């Protein structure tokens, strides 16, 4: 399964953030980690910004960056534009069940 | 499609149709999410034996299944329950790990 913290996240523009994920199983599975991450835009469906844990999707611009071991992986945006508010969720593919992460809102600190 | 209202203990049949592709040569996830923002898996199959594995959530009262010539993939709710409640998605895997597209959701409402 999986644990996703934190809850909210207030970030500024230009900040840089990091949200992390703990997987109740190993989610390694032939050499790879099935472990990806999802922004779901207010008002649509989720998209894929990395998978198999680091791997960037084509599309998504180099914000992103995904990492992790053993059962800690991490979603980092160096640079916070305004575009990536929304919430985030990391979701792993090694057994079975699959499963998601409860969600990160990213919300952007303003005047 | 195929969502609405429907009374507790229903029965309903959610539809996905698939284009860009061949339907039969990746797998498919129905995943839903409910008013509070939570995500959760539905169900998994394999699109060629007609095979679907699932949560304890629904084990039993869903059942996923697809046709291959006709690029389409079914979910047939029974017995639903007011937890059933959520917008459902359906989404084309990619690799093994994580999903290529694709679906605009499909609100179901069990009052």
């Known amino acids: 399964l999986m644990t996703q913290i934190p809850a909210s996240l207030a970030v500024s523009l230009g900040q840089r953030a990091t949200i992390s994920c703990k997987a109740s199983?190993?989610?390694?599975?032939?050499?790879?980690?099935?472990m990806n991450w999802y922004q779901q835009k207010p008002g649509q469906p989720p998209k894929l910004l990395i998978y198999?844990?680091?791997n960037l999707e084509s599309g998504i611009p180099a914000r992103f960056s995904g990492s992790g071991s053993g059962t800690d992986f991490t979603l980092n945006i160096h640079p916070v534009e305004e575009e990536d508010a929304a919430t985030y969720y990391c979701?792993?593919?090694?057994?079975?069940?699959?499963?998601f992460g409860g969600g990160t809102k990213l919300d952007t600190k303003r005047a | 499609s195929g969502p609405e209202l429907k009374k507790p203990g229903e029965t309903v049949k959610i539809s996905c149709k698939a284009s860009?592709?061949?339907?039969?040569?990746?797998?498919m996830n129905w995943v839903k999410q409910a008013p509070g923002e939570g995500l959760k898996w539905m169900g998994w199959?394999?699109?060629?034996?007609?095979?679907?594995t699932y949560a304890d959530d629904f084990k039993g009262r869903f059942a996923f299944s697809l046709k291959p010539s006709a690029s389409t993939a079914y979910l047939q709710i029974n017995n639903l329950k007011n937890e059933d409640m959520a917008t459902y998605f359906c989404?084309?895997?990619?690799?093994?790990?994580?999903?290529?597209?694709w679906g605009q959701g499909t609100t179901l409402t069990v009052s």
């Open positions: 989404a084309r895997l990619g690799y093994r790990s994580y999903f290529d597209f």
């Open positions: 860009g592709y061949t339907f039969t040569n990746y797998g």
């Open positions: 199959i394999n699109t060629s034996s007609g095979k679907a």
């Open positions: 199983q190993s989610v390694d599975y032939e050499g790879d980690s099935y």
């Open positions: 198999a844990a680091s």
């Open positions: 979701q792993q593919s090694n057994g079975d069940p699959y499963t």
